[PDB]
Design a binder for this molecule. Structure first.
Ligand SMILES: Nc1ncnc2c1ncn2[C@@H]1O[C@H](CSCC[C@H](N)C(=O)O)[C@@H](O)[C@H]1O
Ligand SMILES: Nc1ncnc2c1ncn2[C@@H]1O[C@H](CSCC[C@H](N)C(=O)O)[C@@H](O)[C@H]1O
Ligand SMILES: Cc1cc(O)c2c(c1)C(=O)c1cc(O)cc(O)c1C2=O
Ligand SMILES: Cc1cc(O)c2c(c1)C(=O)c1cc(O)cc(O)c1C2=O
Lengths: 474, 473, 37
């Protein structure tokens, strides 16, 4: 391997993307100042970038990716990608021991020895974990082994839904990822799209869809290594839970998942509350199929007071919504029966017929195509002529563009490249855990036409996750 | 959690940072063009960037990192870091199945035929390669049709480099997965012992892993010998061949020997030029813990007056003689320029009074107790005119170090993102062998416990630097 | 005779000399005004 000369075109696009970066900077600081102006006077300010600010961040992220591709030494860049999982571990370790919350308790910083005492991590090792993150823009170093929050880690202070999402990505998903190569090449696992034969079942060594394994009650002495190749939630070694009335303990992963989709829904699903004309429906009923604890009803309820909701998911998830999540984030909505909960399996006929909107967010991507058309057929059988089914999922674009999605300017990747890195990370999480699939428009059309539904519109929003609006072919 | 207004300082530094990127681009294209003229006339061009180009890549990467920190939505950015490991895996998967080598064998290749020659199913393999393409590795040229791009091309006919990816994506990954649990367990957590690390928790063993790789196992037991470690993924379809004694060597042994060639040529190439080796005359360097001797290979091409002895464990010295040096420099074995020694660097150095004892990526594999013994056995054999050069990351921080040069403000003094590889490896050493990558002051104390003084730190065209050591005499 | 693609060096020098032309214009204007006085 020798180093190659760079071409004319490399230089020209490196200039072109540098000028794009420079224009995006002028847009971003302009819209920071309009944002500031919206904050003082007081809405959507507190949840969403403006359209102008979001387009500049997305553009400027895409340009960032292509500049790195063009200026890096190729072998250096190959080995930086190869090892970048260790930064994931660092963030996971830090968030799992609530270091954002500990640093916010002072903020002139905290000596790492005193940080060490409150985390359980050894101080000189914990120094290297935090300086990893500091070099990469998460946390700050303010003195010799003295650390503090920065503008990025601050969003983790008193943010249990967001910490739950970090914990979900670093726990089951990590070991599932570790076994995903061996799953892909084995001639029996390699081709199946079955929910029961993923890298994840291989990691846990069980034969059950992962949805019910997280719902088990385990005996206290069996729980820490109950995960087999999956090590389990790291904090359980230091914070054991006392057995409940049955002498069993819950798996931490159940409530982590419930809150993680609240957390994740507020980062990437916030756009759908404002870039869809919900107010134009008046006093309508939204049925949140697979609604989880109801995180998306939470976001919509605060803004459109005339909508009525019913949240449909598995029994145990519903009960967490009713006993801890909604009491503590919107008790008036339940006491007025504005939001109702319903234990339901979306492989069956939906009990609610003729509702205005059926919302289905981050459910279709958890299953391969056969299950998916069953779940959509379940709803369809229950829709009125004026009913609307809204699928909230990544509608995947490619580096070379799609007829039905807007492309980035040339010379950028048509899908804005780095801007979509999260969508691709979740694509592999879905393969490792549930055999699910993040889907292109053409792949969504094929399962919607198999379910007797028609796609009326794609909604591009201030998110890399979008809305697919479908009615029945009638 | 609500969104916060950005401050004046965010804007002022976002401008200062953007202007730095813009100056770097003008320097980078200027030095690409000096590179083009030098590639044409024809040395060092083919192995490593110019000084001015290297400072421009390092500065612009530092500025890139700070720009992401200033413009991102904090939560978006937190969840992007949290899940970015799947890109490590995707690359691992693609590189494991020699997808670079396959696409260079052809306008692009259909993914269905890519599936045939990899064993990965075509619908799924599209999604691994469009992940990589979205992030600038490989290119998509058509409807699910793929080809090498400027970044992935460097893996074609590059077994030393491919081995390094495979090493970071195999054992190191499972050690990393169990590294949170190991850090908090009250027994393993405080330990710096080479045998009580996340790696041992993964393998279900007590032996240092330098010897676990060297075990001889029988085929029916081998693929799940790693316990929680899945093993090299290719074994499912490419069984290992039994040797003449009926046992198979474990794949990780051949991988690791070649990996340190690959790794040594990426971040250790600088040291071949930004230290005055020619000035030593005809010198003998002893490559202690030299592995296969990949760095003797890098130096042998350039300074024909130097002579070498490579010190390591039997099987790698063995693999060096039977598959590596035959095919990388058979002339060096006929001229006795290189002699080999199966040796444990925990014993007195067998070669006394050599010009250079080269020790690269050996100290970062051990906590402080082990390092002071290896450093003393080297020096127990040094003459007063002898020189010990250790090639390791000399770790700086985001607030600078007195003995290392800082980046311009507002950039992190250690160039931030430019050092992402050193930190990834810092956690690998913590995860697998309880090693440590060290600051200048942490290097100084372990050298004075071995009776050595730090003579100079050599800043080079690499994050990895050189420490030159004397005898305390 | 066919047209040939331009090289990286052609682009980089066309930029560098344009930037030289532009610096020279500012000097010339400054010294026209000193000369006139
Ligand atoms: N068989 C089934 N019937 C109903 N809901 C199910 C189900 N299997 C899984 N689910 C639910 O499907 C959801 C997938 S995650 C999506 C959660 C929610 N839509 C949000 O975006 O916040 C989980 O909440 C899980 O509880
Ligand atoms: N006790 C011991 N005696 C000798 N060599 C050892 C050893 N324990 C580990 N090693 C060797 O130390 C090396 C660490 S990796 C460094 C390889 C080489 N310096 C390079 O940079 O390419 C491995 O090759 C391993 O085989
Ligand atoms: C191990 C694992 C299993 C899952 O079912 C999910 C995930 C991980 C997961 O990370 C996830 C993220 C998300 O944003 C939406 C989801 O529906 C999910 C998931 O559904
Ligand atoms: C599982 C594992 C064990 C190791 O001992 C190393 C590594 C991985 C490793 O990745 C590594 C990289 C490197 O650049 C230098 C090393 O000495 C190394 C290693 O020594």
């Amino acid at each position: 391997m020798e180093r190659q000369p760079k071409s004319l075109s490399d230089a020209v696009q490196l200039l072109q993307t540098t000028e794009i970066i420079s224009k995006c900077t002028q847009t971003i600081i302009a819209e920071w100042s309009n944002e500031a102006e919206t904050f003082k006077k007081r809405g959507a300010e507190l949840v969403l970038p403006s359209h102008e600010l979001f387009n500049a961040q997305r553009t400027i992220t895409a340009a960032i990716g292509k500049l790195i591709e063009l200026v890096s030494e190729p072998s250096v860049r190959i080995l930086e990608i190869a090892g970048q999982y260790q930064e994931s571990r660092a963030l996971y370790i830090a968030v799992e021991r609530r270091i954002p919350d500990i640093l916010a308790s002072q903020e002139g910083g905290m000596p790492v020895k005193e940080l060490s005492s409150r985390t359980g991590i050894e101080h000189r090792k914990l120094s290297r974990i935090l300086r990893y993150l500091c070099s990469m823009g998460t946390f700050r170093q303010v003195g010799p082994d003295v650390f503090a929050n920065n503008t990025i880690s601050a969003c983790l202070v008193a943010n249990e839904p967001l910490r739950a999402y970090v914990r979900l990505t670093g726990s089951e998903a990590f070991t599932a990822s570790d076994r995903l190569p061996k799953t892909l090449l084995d001639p029996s696992t390699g081709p199946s799209y079955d929910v029961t034969r993923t890298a994840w079942q291989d990691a846990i060594g069980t034969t059950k869809p992962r949805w019910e394994w997280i719902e088990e009650r385990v005996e206290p002495d069996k729980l820490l290594d109950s995960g087999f190749h999956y090590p389990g939630i790291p904090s359980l070694i230091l914070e054991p839970q006392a057995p409940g009335e049955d002498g069993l303990v819950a798996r931490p992963e159940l409530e982590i998942m419930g809150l993680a989709m609240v957390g994740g829904g507020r980062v990437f699903g916030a756009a759908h509350v404002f870039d869809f004309p919900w107010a134009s429906l008046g006093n309508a009923l939204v049925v949140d199929v697979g609604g989880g604890v109801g995180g998306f009803a939470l976001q919509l309820s605060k803004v459109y007071p005339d909508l009525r909701f019913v949240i449909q998911d598995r029994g145990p998830v519903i009960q967490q919504a009713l006993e801890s999540v909604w009491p503590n984030e919107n008790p008036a909505a339940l006491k007025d029966q504005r939001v109702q909960f319903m234990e339901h399996s979306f492989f069956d006929k939906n009990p609610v017929e003729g509702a205005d909107v059926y919302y289905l967010r981050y459910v279709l991507h958890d299953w391969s195509d056969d299950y998916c058309v069953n779940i959509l057929s379940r709803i369809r059988e229950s829709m009125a002529p004026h009913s609307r089914l809204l699928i909230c999922e990544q509608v995947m674009n490619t580096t070379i563009g799609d007829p039905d999605l807007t492309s980035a300017p040339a010379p950028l990747p048509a899908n804005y490249g780095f801007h979509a890195r999260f969508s691709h990370s979740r694509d592999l999480t879905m393969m490792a855990a549930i055999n699910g699939i993040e889907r292109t428009p053409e792949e969504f059309k094929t399962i919607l036409k198999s379910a007797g539904l028609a796609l009326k519109q794609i909604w591009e929003c201030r998110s890399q996750v979008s809305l697919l609006e479908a009615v029945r072919a009638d």
